[PDB]
């Protein structure tokens, strides 16, 4: 995946099966920068066009930190324009990732804070090593999360838990995050990458055309009320049926055999 295009060397992409592995490679904290943000949005676009990929996994280079958030240089003083433009880039990149047609899993191999946590929130599922600590510390410096942190964090864990981290600037351990629902699963140190890939391989096992259409329905509630999507849900359901791939899944279950699709 993404074998032919101008992509920052800071982001390295390795394709495993139908899963594309994206690693932030910025030393020493894997801090986000304008070059990586541009690459990510572009990468997501390229990966979406590719039909051979059904899942994506994001992890931080190095053991210590998945992502330290935004690099200090981006917010260097004396330029108002810079802050504006860069808020744009986080939103575009993270929303693109949030909009990846395939399943996205974030393997938190180190502590995720600020932009780093916002990136993980973009991914559909989060898997974290026990030692990682996740928090939004922007409030301490007088900046809000501008990557969608304000919306995303309450959504998963509720407003009260979201408020303590951003408002009170309190970091949470993996055990806490799993308890509040921030992270779906907890893993032993260093196992986040393998578990994510292992899970991403399971995603390859579901119909590609189906996964791509179902994911918007799940995330529809963000745009609009859930009851409104109900007519569309049946309609999308009818569209699937009008596919070669659809008939294969039902037949396979009927005959007790593994489904095979294109």
């Amino acid at each position: 995946k993404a074998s032919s295009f101008d992509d920052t060397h800071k982001l390295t992409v390795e394709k495993h099966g139908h899963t594309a592995l994206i690693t932030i490679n910025h030393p020493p904290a894997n801090t986000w920068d304008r070059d990586s943000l541009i690459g990510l949005r572009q990468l997501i676009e390229h990966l979406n066009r590719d039909d051979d990929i059904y899942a994506l996994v994001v992890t931080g280079q190095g053991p210590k930190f998945f992502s330290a958030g935004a690099d200090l240089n981006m917010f260097a003083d004396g330029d108002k324009a810079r802050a504006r433009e860069m808020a744009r880039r986080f939103g575009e990149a993270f929303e693109a990732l949030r909009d990846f047609r395939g399943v996205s899993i974030a393997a938190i191999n180190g502590y995720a804070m600020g932009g780093g946590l916002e990136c993980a929130l973009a991914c559909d599922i989060r898997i974290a090593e026990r030692q990682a600590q996740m928090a939004l510390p922007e409030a301490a410096v007088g900046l809000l999360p501008c990557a969608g942190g304000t919306q995303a964090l309450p959504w998963l864990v509720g407003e009260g838990w979201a408020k303590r981290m951003i408002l009170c600037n309190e970091r949470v351990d993996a055990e806490t995050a799993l308890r509040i629902g921030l992270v779906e699963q907890v893993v032993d140190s260093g196992e986040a990458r393998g578990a994510a890939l292992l899970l991403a391989a399971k995603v390859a096992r579901q119909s590609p055309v189906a996964i791509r259409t179902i994911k918007p329905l799940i995330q529809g509630a963000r745009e609009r009320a859930p009851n409104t999507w109900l007519p569309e849900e049946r309609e999308r359901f009818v569209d699937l049926f009008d596919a070669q791939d659809t008939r294969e899944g039902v037949n396979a279950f009927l005959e007790k055999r593994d489904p095979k699709w294109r």
Copy 2:
């Protein structure tokens, strides 16, 4: 309850006190069929009209399946017209149950998957035995949940967990479900029905007229933003107050005695 109209033998309703008990009776997996869906909507309409019933309980016949989901014959390939119509049936049927004036409790005594889970999601409160496992496997066959699963599950348990079950096709034990908020309470095997009837009997102890009005307000957020409903809440409260029944519930508390209403 539902003593005489043409009701499918597949669905049997027995009346205990003020609670109507509905059980799927389809062998061997209790899988849903077109006839059951029609009856369920009709049963809900008839139940709403009856004023002697304050609570509803649905369980799966036998100790192995609350519900197996949709029957394969119903989705047998590959006629597109049928598919459109069965999804329509699910939506109306599940929505009708979701909109029941009285409280709806689903007692999970068996495997509840696909359509069955969606049905359980339709119920206000879910009680599950420790052994039961719930998941949405429609993505594996290339079919989406058309019963409101795409909305209902993320609402109850959050997006991250919901995607994992549907997108990753990952079943959940009773313990995970209670932890993620999917199920309100966990019970020993075979005790779901007894627990369901027991919880339903307490609901009959609250004002009938109140219960029907209060349920819409709670489910208001799905149609629209919560804050929009605040004016309506006060207006519905006063509508409750201009009733003979409301004066009785308050009086009982003052005199420290059980309230008595029609």
Copy 3:
């Protein structure tokens, strides 16, 4: 603050640092009254105007109850005109606290149900003693929660749990509440007030200008879908950057010193 106006002696406010302490002092159950509701709304308005206060704490006088809910004298039969007016007073008072620019922490040192629970829900963060029990018992007497309870409780804990407390009239201990996400933290008896003050101290360490702007974004989901707020989230961020205060927060981290603002 709030020592120079007419404020009911039932509500006592103590100013500690940048935290304002609000105590309900109505014996014996700390039940809400018209005099308290008016003071609360006025109090919140004065507190917002004050620039020395960054956090708010509310606690119930006495060990046994944080708040009893609404006073019985407040809902005596059979007058409807008042009932309409009292319900209005709750909404006005509760929304004012909910929209307090600073962080609001509710310390639950006693049983908090009905109106009292509704009050805690308005607060940003809730800390509860192990013994405290919280429920909405209005349905049993035929009254719906009029303080925004129908919206606030499902939002934090989800519909299934929320329906149980109101519809089924079931009380929850601190432990269940922490599990369901109703309370962010559980504390040893008598320590909630001290812990809340301590947590309130953490809020002082974050930039005031940031906290006030940031708080609306997190609560944006209630008024509208979260995705709608994303362009605003970037816009408000640029506004924060256009200040003398914001540059101090970022610069302090680079040189790893505590931020100093006014």
Copy 4:
């Protein structure tokens, strides 16, 4: 319809063909009364139950007043309970009128002001005699339109014109209202009833089942954004097709003969 039920003599119902004619009979100004409000809501429900009536027409007794608006008796000082209760009936009454399944035609034969204009707004279509003048004068007396005027008037004619009438208390002649979209058609004096009845006969020519389903869709925008209803529009369309009546209408045009349905 309304042949054998307890209805106020102030309101008279005449059944012509498939249209039921309802006339306000309050002397001398045809002002609304509690008896009128109750009868209206009760009547509308009854009309909705009757399948023989596909259209509705509303007219004001006497040549001079279509609807005097609210009676002073209702808002007579100084009881507060009276006002809250009475606003409730207008909302219930008009909304029921607004929600009539068959078409509602408002024939303006006389002065329509205050509640009367609000009533006409509830009607789907308005036909007015050239002489009649309509405005909302409640602001002059310190009362807002509580019948939905604040929403309804702006929707039809725009914010600028609506504010002018309500905020500036400016009455409009038939010609001006037609120019602004307040009234779809203008008729010579005394021809409103005939034109409204005659327009109502045309509606019977359209499929009753189609008509009842289509009207909510048109009115969907008031509850939610237009685009949101698009999936459901297709769904209800297919629902029409699975009906004996649809096949006849579709068939009738092809033969070039008038459709015949029940």
Copy 5:
């Protein structure tokens, strides 16, 4: 445009300058067909890709019919599947037209009824010859408009006028449509095509990049409340500003010369 593409022979594409001319050519009433609808969607997508096109015009072949809507063979009885599929096609095609990045001008040279009217509505601007009559007659055959007509018509003309056309099956002349706002301009017979091309040329005089971004904003209200879109309007404005194309327009007004962009 679109010469090296497979489009139904019925749809004719002519390129004048930056304006692409599409003519429906289905005899004898220019009624829509499945072959036509897919091409239309496809044609729009190809047009969106081409940067050489800034405007779009659609007119009906021959003087007599702009567009007759859906053919009966398309809706021929008795299969339900046929109708579900065609309803999807109208929505997809018309929504694609509505989403054309460039301005779409509808030139009404003939009868526009049913789908044809819906097609016109999908266009941004409508220019009609005095003789053309536009109505929705689907209700007379018992079928609602499935092309988004139920939403599109009340949006342009208001509910009251919209209801009469759909509910009462009333056709409107060019003058009446102009008065009600259905058509922006009325033209002499046979001048609709020339006028549309001439109008389309004027759009070329505004910045292409600006036009594509601005057009969604105007249509934002359909998705959401207008007030929600304002922060985004400011954001997109800044995005436009960060481009060479924007600097040219400002320069042109300053020196009083015509703006020149790619």
Copy 6:
């Protein structure tokens, strides 16, 4: 008002009765500038505090220009920072005018283009001189309207007419504007101010408390769908009833005499 407040020389405020007259005083074109934008927002705020003001009128100094739109220097190339900040002031300033509790009347005394038209749209009612021409030309310059013009214009005149002005860069005379609903009234040259003030004298005749509360209801549809506001409309009605001023207006009509309030 603005008796003792810090305002730029460029806005002139004269108090006539209960109407505050605000005139843009920028030569030669009355073009908007950063200094005026701030004054506008502050002036609106101050006008809001004064209880002696019930109406607002905005006009441009000189006969020829109500407003030239935005000043060229503020949007001068090429700093991205300047443009972002300038867009921000337009929104704050215009929304403030939009949010004035008292009625706002725009007297179009001269050419109103770009910002000027957007400024006029913020006003509740627009009165224009026959010779005045209004258009949005920003698209010709490659800039979108950042003053909410994209939202405001289609709301008043509809999308179709809105698109031609902005997308086709076409200017409209008063007869055209009046016809399309852009302006409520057309006036003879030079009488706009007198007519505006005269119309502003009318609002003084209506209860001040009702006007301030009623105006948000009319404008509630912009934030959210209209049916949502109906419960609140009833609630606000009841709040007005709980006021001394409300009783006075109703009495005057009963006694057929002029209402008198403070």
